[PDB]
Design a protein around this nucleic acid. Sequence first.
DNA 1: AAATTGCTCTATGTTAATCGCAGAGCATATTT
DNA 2: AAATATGCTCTATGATTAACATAGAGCAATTT
Lengths: 92, 89, 91, 90, 91, 92
Amino acid sequence: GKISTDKYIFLTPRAYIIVHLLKVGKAKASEISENTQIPYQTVIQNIRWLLAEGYVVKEQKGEEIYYKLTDKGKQLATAELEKIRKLVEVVQ
Amino acid sequence: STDKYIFLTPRAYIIVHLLKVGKAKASEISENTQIPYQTVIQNIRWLLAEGYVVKEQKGEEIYYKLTDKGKQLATAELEKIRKLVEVVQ
Amino acid sequence: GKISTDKYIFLTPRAYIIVHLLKVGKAKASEISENTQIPYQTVIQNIRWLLAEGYVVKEQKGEEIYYKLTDKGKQLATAELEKIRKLVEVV
Amino acid sequence: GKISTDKYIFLTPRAYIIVHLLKVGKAKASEISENTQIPYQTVIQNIRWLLAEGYVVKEQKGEEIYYKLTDKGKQLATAELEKIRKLVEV
Amino acid sequence: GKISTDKYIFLTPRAYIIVHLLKVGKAKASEISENTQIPYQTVIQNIRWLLAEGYVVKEQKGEEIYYKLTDKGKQLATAELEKIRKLVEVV
Amino acid sequence: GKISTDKYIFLTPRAYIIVHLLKVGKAKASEISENTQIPYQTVIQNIRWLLAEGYVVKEQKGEEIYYKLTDKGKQLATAELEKIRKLVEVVQ
DNA sequence: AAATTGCTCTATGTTAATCGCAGAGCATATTT
DNA sequence: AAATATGCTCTATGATTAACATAGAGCAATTT
């Protein structure tokens, strides 16, 4: 699929999406988009995926939808986080 | 459901490698990074097109190494990574 | 919410997927999209929704991803298609 | 557009809205939302679209606008209603 | 290994492409793929090579991306083309 | 397959091989190499293919293998050349 | 000399992921 | 109340390209 492109040379859109949640805790798609500088359509499309694999869960308050990492989500993230660290250490 | 390229892209692994070994061959890159060969060449051609990498044909042996521009990119992107991982630390 | 649909004005592309899954049991994304006339993207985008609810399960058999219905996907499959014939019996 | 959501798993709103007309004939937008179990703002929207297509039209019962089904709408109903029956076949 | 080309038996896809741009001036992946009847992937892939060698440059026009031979690209397109004619008269 | 390269940018190796036969008629393998500057291992791989297609058949004269253009190889070779002529014409 | 073997790159198709556009379901803000 | 414009926010799906596999093919070095 469309993994490595000019905009995504090293990290994929999800990398930015997840990392953003690790900080804000919970945020809307619109939030994720404008903050990570990623076109909305790419965000929700990725969110759906994360929702399929239990990495993220919804949070409806009638009108406003919030997304947040699941325990296995944060599990995925430190794991990938440390892997990055590894890559950046061998390299330099 | 691409469980292989979650956070990092293949292009990334390819770069970082040519940054730690400098000179390398396609199959060698593929093997050392567990990235299907056909993905390596494809990305190599793009990289070669952007001038981030150059070919080094020594006799019949084909080699690919980074360039002043490729290294700039490599280090530049890598830094962007660190700044992104910092606040999570 | 302006409207113009000549395809899903009574049935959601979701039902077409759910149902088709009962027949063959398991099928790649490309697969149902062909036997259901439902565009590819719409299929995958909708199967990720079912995976979220637990109405379907992923079964990778080598290089191809085979999506199969689940117990929860069966409850709904038979329970929903019930209130359906219900609708048409009443009218 | 937005079709299959959390409320609409199999049958779209129009599915119920139209069924309401097959049964009660003329029903105010208000009475639809109530029987249809579909949110009001939604009912108005769908009828507006259904009106546009000539699938349904208004009837001024004095100070109240009751909406009625049309032969155009009936044909669509019976038609769709059979593509469904046909689907449940399995 | 083994040979079985039904198309490129005397001409390379890179031969058509280079040529097309020499007369059209500028074009997109699509324009090349449609005219030269060379498949998309093959076209785009050969452009990368032309870019690497500097035989072609990108002309960015908004969301539009065209290509055209360069100084060294043109002279090449005309150089080998002569050797082509050279061969066509050896008979 | 390997059709385009730094060497065979415009013309394929076959092109060179066939086109020389239309002009030496029968030539041996090594004679083809020296003229068209194509490695022996290549002059062979392609002949092997040409033989199987009957486009060009071998004629024994002493001990050196000869290769002459059969009738099929004439039609083919003329079909390629005629199309070559076109391409260069539209380019202009 | 030629055919077997072997490494590397080419052609090109199947599937898939980006991100743009036209919806649509519904809660808000307005209609005054 | 309910109706219009309405503003959110997500879905349906089309178009461009990437991931990666299959079938070549250019060329050594080995073996018939």
